[PDB]
Structure 1
């Protein structure tokens, strides 16, 4: 049930960035992956050009890794499913929109529990208090992500016909789920952003190996 216009092919043997996606800031396609960060204090975006018209259920699988640094930082990678009439112009929150309307999934390790993958909601009306990110997650889970030889796959499933289940999974292992989130039908934006910040002069490099978008669950 895979959808091509909203997915990212095998980047191995892709030499030019696929035409249905746009990169930004220091994001380039190196070697079978889109490297979002790689120089000290870098940032990178990678978003779909066309907007997804959400009416029914969906499954969204991201595949990523981090390399080149072990230790605490204010860096992080975040995945977005946010309502907007184009690629979000705001970059103030992990190289992404601080004033979003939908879902942010943040992988970082600067919070009270160390490495996590967390859930974050806003409605577009007022931007989020970044100093409150960790107090304001609707759901989270412990998640070693730093360096781990193999990439992790985050699987986001939204099951409209089951009292709207938002279930996130890391490597087929349940990270969290809820029914407190019901996306109103609209045109949504899909992308990932990152930054490694400045702490301890780190060069944490975030890589995107693939992303798959299915209609339905």
Structure 2
């Protein structure tokens, strides 16, 4: 059902890290520890997980990330990003440990937004300008509690070009937003990943599971 080539293996069940994670790039301080990835294991650390192969959609797709933030509740500029990006590259991690401020794609961000607070905010960039997280606009949002939970959450992104590019984003099976503004994935290969950065308070951003499906799931 899920596309193994564009998913994480069951992390707990991994016996050969090198073989079963061959399709993934571990960036910066991310470590596999007792069955999950800790993106930000230390004070003021960054980490990322990126799929090596670019993904080309057939009809529709679903991406499900299972994540949590553990160990810290309070004020911080740290956050956790989920990315769909297209076009060339660079090695920048200036934006949430994951990207240049100038990128072409979609960033779905869990952070303390300066006006919403604890939230999911979704941003599009077309590669021509620097995203300033304070002043650049997001196109969609919801309020969502994530700090300091052992209990993980699932972000589910469904995207169907055949339904005029309907993208739905659910958090724990509840709709955060729906949009038809994100169209680039229908007609171009793109890269899939996640990244996070914390501060000295040592917020632990963690990835427990990731699955991609070559369709819209019931």
Contact persistence 1:85–1:187 (CA under 8 A) = no
Match of 1:204 in 2: 203
CA displacement at 1:211 relative to structure 2: 0.4
Match of 1:216 in 2: 215
Match of 2:10 in 1: 10
Distance 1:215 1:74 in 2: 35
| Consecutive unaligned residues in structure 2, runs of 5 or more | none
- Corresponding residue to 2:84 among 69, 81, 85: 81
Match of 2:126 in 1: 123
Moved over 3 A (4+): none
Contact persistence 2:169–2:175 (CA under 8 A) = yes
The 5-angstrom pairing of residues 110-149 of structure 1 reads: 110-133=113-136, 136-149=137-150
| Consecutive unaligned residues in structure 1, runs of 5 or more | none
Match of 2:164 in 1: 163
Stretch of structure 1 that moved more, 100-109 or 54-63 = 54-63
Partner secondary structure for residue 161 of structure 1: helix
CA root-mean-square deviation? 1.5
CA-to-aligned-CA distance 1:133-169 (integer Å, 9 cap, x gap): 4xx0101001000112310000000011212111100
Match of 2:194 in 1: 192
CA-to-aligned-CA distance 1:27-57 (integer Å, 9 cap, x gap): 1111111110021101001101111123532
TM-score normalised according to structure 1 size = 0.92
Partner secondary structure for residue 134 of structure 2: helix
Contact persistence 1:90–1:99 (CA under 8 A) = no
Match of 1:51 in 2: 54
Distance 1:123 1:5 in 2: 27
Number of residue equivalences:
211
Contact persistence 2:66–2:208 (CA under 8 A) = yes
Distance 1:104 1:73 in 2: 19
CA displacement at 1:85 relative to structure 2: 4.7
Match of 2:181 in 1: 180
CA-to-aligned-CA distance 1:106-135 (integer Å, 9 cap, x gap): 0001421211011100011222123314xx
